[PDB]
Amino acid sequence: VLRSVNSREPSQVIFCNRSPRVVLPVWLNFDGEPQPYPTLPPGTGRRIHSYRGHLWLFRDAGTHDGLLVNQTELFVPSLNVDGQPIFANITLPVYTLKERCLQVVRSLVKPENYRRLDIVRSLYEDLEDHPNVQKDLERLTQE
């Protein structure tokens, strides 16, 4: 269900990274398969050529933590008005404290050593449940 539409109608977009992360843009192709695009460093913007009805999501390039674009999960280019580009402002979500702690711990501990940490077993499983695009697409489809 979540797939780009082959509109063939050009739409110019500014991918504007307003996050502290290196951002990976992800394009959902016409079969709903996610395709990675070039990364954007923190504090950078790029004018890119996309199409109306196309679907994009944004993630941390190294960790795949999910990011927000114009305050939501999915970005769909629309029609350009006045020759103005559509802005896609990529930002951090407000992560839960638990998820942010999981991010930092994963950043420090190799997955093979998660089970060495002195914490309850359910948190081993939470640490091992790394963020990933495919699961979020399934969550979004069901919504």
Binding site: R18, S19, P20, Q71, N89, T91, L92, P93, V94, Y95, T96, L97, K98, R100, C101, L102, V104, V105, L108, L117, I119, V120, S122, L123, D126
Partner: protein, 88 residues
Amino acid sequence: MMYVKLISSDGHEFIVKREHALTSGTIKAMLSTNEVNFREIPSHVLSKVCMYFTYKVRYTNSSTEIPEFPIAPEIALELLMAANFLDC
């Protein structure tokens, strides 16, 4: 506004807005005196939890660009355990 007192294991008293504290479903249940004691959370963790409450209320549903919530490596594991318990 209404304030609650959250007390760490080492006896530090943290006075925060109730609306901020209710970010944690655990704390809401513990409140429902106006004081909550955490026998397992020391102040170098609970102070950071209160900063998170402030951070969440300020930036949730905000269009300003959102800064990262910072967490030093030396507190990360205990803060994870507190966050798991507090459900926030």
